[PDB]
Amino acid sequence: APTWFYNTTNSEKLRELQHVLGGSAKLGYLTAKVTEILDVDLETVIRAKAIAAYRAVRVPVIVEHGALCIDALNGLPGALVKPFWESLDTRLCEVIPAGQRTARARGALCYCDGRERHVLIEETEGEIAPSARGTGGFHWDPIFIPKGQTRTFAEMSLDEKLSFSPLGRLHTRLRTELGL
Amino acid sequence: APTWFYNTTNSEKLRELQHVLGGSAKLGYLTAKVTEILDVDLETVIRAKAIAAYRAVRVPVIVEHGALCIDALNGLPGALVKPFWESLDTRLCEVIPAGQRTARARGALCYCDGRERHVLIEETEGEIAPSARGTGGFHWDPIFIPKGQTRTFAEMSLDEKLSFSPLGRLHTRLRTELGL
Amino acid sequence: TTLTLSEAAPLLKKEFREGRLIPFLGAGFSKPLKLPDGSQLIASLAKTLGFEPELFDMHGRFEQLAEFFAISAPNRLQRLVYEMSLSFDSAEAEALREKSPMHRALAALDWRTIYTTNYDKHVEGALRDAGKQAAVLASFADFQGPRARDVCEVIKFHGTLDQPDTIVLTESSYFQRMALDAPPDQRLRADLLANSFLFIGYSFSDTNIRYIWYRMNQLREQSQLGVKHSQARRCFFATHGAGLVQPDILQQWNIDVIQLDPTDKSASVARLLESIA
Amino acid sequence: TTLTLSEAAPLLKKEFREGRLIPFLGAGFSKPLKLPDGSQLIASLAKTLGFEPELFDMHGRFEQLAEFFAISAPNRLQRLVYEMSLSFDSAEAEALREKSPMHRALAALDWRTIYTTNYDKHVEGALRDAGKQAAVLASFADFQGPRARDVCEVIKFHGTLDQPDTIVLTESSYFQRMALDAPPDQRLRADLLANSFLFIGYSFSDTNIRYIWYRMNQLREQSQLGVKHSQARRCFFATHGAGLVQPDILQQWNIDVIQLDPTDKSASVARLLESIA
Amino acid sequence: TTLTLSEAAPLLKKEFREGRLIPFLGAGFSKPLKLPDGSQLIASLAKTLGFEPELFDMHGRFEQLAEFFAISAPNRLQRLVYEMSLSFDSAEAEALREKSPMHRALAALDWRTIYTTNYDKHVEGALRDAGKQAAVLASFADFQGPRARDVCEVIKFHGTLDQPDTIVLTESSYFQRMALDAPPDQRLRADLLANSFLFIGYSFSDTNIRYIWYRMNQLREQSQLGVKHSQARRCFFATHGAGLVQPDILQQWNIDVIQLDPTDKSASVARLLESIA
Amino acid sequence: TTLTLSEAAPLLKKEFREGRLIPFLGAGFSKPLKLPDGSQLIASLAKTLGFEPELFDMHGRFEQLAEFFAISAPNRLQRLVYEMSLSFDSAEAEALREKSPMHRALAALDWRTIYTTNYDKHVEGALRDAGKQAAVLASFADFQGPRARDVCEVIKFHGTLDQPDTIVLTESSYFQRMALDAPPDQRLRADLLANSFLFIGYSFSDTNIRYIWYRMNQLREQSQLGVKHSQARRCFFATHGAGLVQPDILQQWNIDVIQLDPTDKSASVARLLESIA
Numbered sequence A, B: 001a002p003t004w005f006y007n008t009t010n011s012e013k014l015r016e017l018q019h020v021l022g023g024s025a026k027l028g029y030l031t032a033k034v035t036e037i038l039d040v041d042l043e044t045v046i047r048a049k050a051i052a053a054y055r056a057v058r059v060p061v062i063v064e065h066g067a068l069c070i071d072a073l074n075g076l077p078g079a080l081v082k083p084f085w086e087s088l089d090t091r092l093c094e095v096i097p098a099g100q101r102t103a104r105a106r107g108a109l110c111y112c113d114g115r116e117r118h119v120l121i122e123e124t125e126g127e128i129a130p131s132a133r134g135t136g137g138f139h140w141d142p143i144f145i146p147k148g149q150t151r152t153f154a155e156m157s158l159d160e161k162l163s164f165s166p167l168g169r170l171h172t173r174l175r176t177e178l179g180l
Numbered sequence C, D, E, F: 001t002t003l004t005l006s007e008a009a010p011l012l013k014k015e016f017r018e019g020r021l022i023p024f025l026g027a028g029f030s031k032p033l034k035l036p037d038g039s040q041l042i043a044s045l046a047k048t049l050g051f052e053p054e055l056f057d058m059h060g061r062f063e064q065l066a067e068f069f070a071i072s073a074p075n076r077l078q079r080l081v082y083e084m085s086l087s088f089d090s091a092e093a094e095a096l097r098e099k100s101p102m103h104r105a106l107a108a109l110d111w112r113t114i115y116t117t118n119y120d121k122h123v124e125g126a127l128r129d130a131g132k133q134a135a136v137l138a139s140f141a142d143f144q145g146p147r148a149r150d151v152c153e154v155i156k157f158h159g160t161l162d163q164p165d166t167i168v169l170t171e172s173s174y175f176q177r178m179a180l181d182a183p184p185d186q187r188l189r190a191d192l193l194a195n196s197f198l199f200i201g202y203s204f205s206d207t208n209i210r211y212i213w214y215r216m217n218q219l220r221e222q223s224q225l226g227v228k229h230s231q232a233r234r235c236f237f238a239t240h241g242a243g244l245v246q247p248d249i250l251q252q253w254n255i256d257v258i259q260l261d262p263t264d265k266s267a268s269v270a271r272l273l274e275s276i277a
């Protein structure tokens, strides 16, 4: 039986974390739906998301929340990235001026055992594409190009995306600190 | 002694609602700080704000939340207007293309007596200014020009701003439904 | 600090073959029958009173919101029992009960006493489905009534829907049971003197259940047994989602926690009841 | 459905001049002295145990989190009493107590019995500030000890910090008081037979206080008085923020709610105590 | 016949760099914190009992007057501990403790064991002020509790205020320690087998301390060592005002007297603790 | 709170005719023989050492000043015993002893065991004056020596002058008796198990006498007798000038105080010993 449970309602995040942390027999999976607080800071939202997901499932839980801070929007959306891609789908490439396309793709894991909340944060420098390209992946992957690379997260496979994305450095930090 | 309590931490909203509903002896004032949920819909946020403020003060409470839906940003920020003016102060006039500056200034009151939540919503058509002008008022008033008018909310006095703003139609609806 | 399923299985076989294991079934045992738990009742009481269900929840505890419901109008509690009877003991809840793996695994064992705190005929009804016969004991007239010789006695600890005077739901009915003078209270305290219990689908939120296990330790500590002998007779608490505080409170009362797999709640309970056989 | 301050003022004068009004003071009465209430204690217990204070709160009720604290290590409860003694009865809490308008207005009246459920010397200390003398009664040895002739007896209902065996904080200590056999329990039930009470700064969250007012109605209903005569002797519950459910539960127990002005909590209480004079 | 400060300084450096020097701190070490010594307690006990403080002093010794206090009324000793905790560990005694030169000079050294006979958190509190961490050991549960690896263990030899059962103040509690069976007694007698002690602010008036150094010589004399080798391991007794009889009694027990300058008591001790570094 | 002479006289007759009363005689019993008490010895030790007798008294207690005397020079304690022999057992102290009314009234009764803590042959010498015969028991060789069949055994509890190794005067000799292993210690603790004692002319200032009565209550309290039966066997303490603290300390140890008339000390004791007959 598992001792840690990764809670997400997003079935595309589920197949990413099962691609690397899938063979760990100490990790289970839950699908409880939580409501995030209104703040652009990633550290504040992921810390209030774990206390709201432990209250739902009542087991040691691991939650995940991201950020897409943009220099042209002075850090917007930040942790408000979920309603931007709902509203501005590929017009988000158009509302940003050409010449200052730089942005940061941040991502955070927070595991709560019922007594303590520990936040792990990784981060990837990049720049917003001039137009959306690529088919693979999911939300905002056709618009983000990492630094040095020419391609998007959507144009790369799941092994190649996790060699650039924040989750590929968060697998090893979550495995080491939890013994998965 | 009052029977209804208007809860806000914003001292500029306090002097607006005391300018019209101030002489009502049935209305008190509280300053409890609540945390909003992450959603662009104004109806969803103001309804979850009253249940979170009744839990704090435990009296019949009236809360207030607004929206600044913009056509060029497909409705963004919506009820996410609080972290935009923190991040983009007057660059918000610059991130929007000239020629499609139209926007809606929405505002909502929700009163909760402990058993029911009733939402009153008013709304003002307008357009974002090409640059911030005006000194009076507070957050995002130098950037919003109502339809027909040439001036901003910041350029107009408090009597003239409430003849255009959503709160000037929400005084009479709150007074009639509560008997203030 | 917490037993697993394979660790607790030889401990439950030993108490069962000696005839000293008694199941205690809660509201989570009728959850696969699509019945309300203690939270969906309050959502239904708030709809009748004109409350929003999230605003009604923050004015008091479960006992106190039902006390407020019962005194809102005359005959308001009688109507609730009628509505619960039509919903809890409906024919589609009967049909989900034969194909339920927990109720089949419960009735496959040859119990002698079963305690429940839920108002439905789905624990004795599970015994009728397996060809066995049961005897519901809820009031004083049931205990003095005629039974057969060797028949599993199902003790409806909080009452039955066909005897609406026995239902304890409101706060005043929980305070009336604090005297421990009701016939289900007197039968429970005598069975607790000699038997291990198995809590399935129940969470210790009732302050009269916790008060009975409190006062069994006042007999245990005053009898001045050793460290070895006062810890010999244990009770078992099968729960998917016990927190961090409650398992250590119950170690005082000789209650061990059996951690079940929370991914599938119904199959984890059914494997526990099949491991006793 | 709820008394105001001017409506309840002639009702409190009549019971006071007959000598049949007794104050019952809670944790909110020591809130202007910058002391913790029942929530800031749990925030301090969570810091010692290594919990975050928001995660520790969702594992049980107030009685159960203090029970978990006291059994975490040996002598863990004794340390808490020592820490509380230095924080609650400190010299800067003494200095805030002479200039407090509630404690001055309380001591200006010539009471004979005062009940408190808080662990601090600021109710009898308010009487010493006004030149009066008080008599703290908490344990069995205090009731049989010598007092003076006509001195206000302050009944520490939940215990005192200078007698750490009398403090009821954990869940096992609340269950030990359910027998209603302690000397503060026996004195309360006899004063409730003949006197009106005034609850100031107290919220009915203790299930042993609510159980005493429950069993006074079992004497009231069995005595078969009329509609007029069973509703004659009332108790009063001054509260800024009572909800929608709790005032109707307490109407069963002859407890009327006095709505105070929630804008300034300290001045609303002080105007109530000055209206009794 | 008596060491000075400069003579005893190289003798204390040698035992400290070998890790075989242990401080023993008395009631005079907390005198700059404006705390009572053994005489101002008796002046406070006489005020409670109704004695004049000069008449109460001539009816017995310090142990016997506190025994008379504790049996005057029930719960009279519990109140004293509560009052002592308010006055010894107050916030203004904390503020005098960071700017005290003795407590800074004590915590600047890297000790491993410190013994105290006073009831206050100002010896381990001095170690927390210097960024170091300490471990208070007073009862049996403290010795078997968890500590860290290399942390200075502060042995509260006469008890601590947060564990009121460990305080030895009355005559019956000194007689209970004559068996040398308490956990601070057993730890002291084993450390005395191998270590030099430094008595600071302590006067040998306790007949259980003097009895431990008595019975270490019964091991020393029965082992039949020479004149040279039985006098090798010394203990040190820093005192401003030792008389004419007591330094010669303690020469029997390998205790040397360090004469400190009596004009400024606090600065003389601080120069001794800085000379060890 | 204190027995008089006529009240205590029937209580002493009952224990004497049952053979369960044993006198315990102190230094005040030899005061009419013009002998030093514990204060005139120290005035004589201070003259030898070169002290003024008022300055020598303020450097320590009685045990500690004699310890300082004995280590001032070699053979300094042997000389003291020789000097005491010449002055305590002189021929003019013999002549005052036949005409003493206390020593005549003591020897008129038919005792079986007498305990003394003074170094003089005036208690067994009083028995030889009345024609009776006594048996002095001070050391191990005396207990195993030959006696007659029914002869009053005088137990020299602190030693005799004709056996100078048995005299306990210095502090190191009192600490050697704290083990309660000496033959007078073992005989006292067995007689205290079954007999009432009568303290005449003795004040409880010896911390080894007080420690024996302490540890008899540790047997008395652990045996869990009632309030009535643990207070049945009393001891008696005849004293002209007991203070206000010491009679209440000794009530713990079942020791009752007999107040004698302080105007004439010798005649008050003699009327007590004649009332036993």
Ligand SMILES: O=c1nc[nH]c2c1ncn2[C@H]1C[C@H](O)[C@@H](COP(=O)(O)OP(=O)(O)OP(=O)(O)O)O1
Residues within 6 Å of the ligand: A007, A008, A009, A010, A013, A032, A033, A034, A064, A065, A066, A081, A082, A085, A107, A137, A138, A139, A140, A141, A165, A167
């Ligand atoms: O690494 C990523 N690579 C591509 N897209 C990503 C990533 N990380 C988040 N995203 C998208 C998903 C979602 O549209 C939004 C985060 O919002 P988020 O609240 O976490 O998604 P959710 O509520 O549907 O699932 P969950 O219950 O786990 O929070 O940005």
Ligand SMILES: O=c1nc[nH]c2c1ncn2[C@H]1C[C@H](O)[C@@H](COP(=O)(O)OP(=O)(O)OP(=O)(O)O)O1
Residues within 6 Å of the ligand: B007, B008, B009, B010, B013, B032, B033, B034, B064, B065, B066, B081, B082, B085, B107, B137, B138, B139, B140, B141, B165, B167
């Ligand atoms: O009519 C308005 N005219 C000018 N500015 C306005 C208006 N209405 C909201 N605003 C600003 C204020 C705040 O910066 C944000 C709303 O966020 P909002 O959460 O309501 O403000 P808040 O938290 O500081 O006070 P409150 O406790 O009442 O929610 O947009």
Ligand SMILES: [Zn+2]
Residues within 6 Å of the ligand: A034, A036, A082
């Ligand atoms: Zn989400």
Ligand SMILES: [Zn+2]
Residues within 6 Å of the ligand: B034, B036, B082
């Ligand atoms: Zn806000």
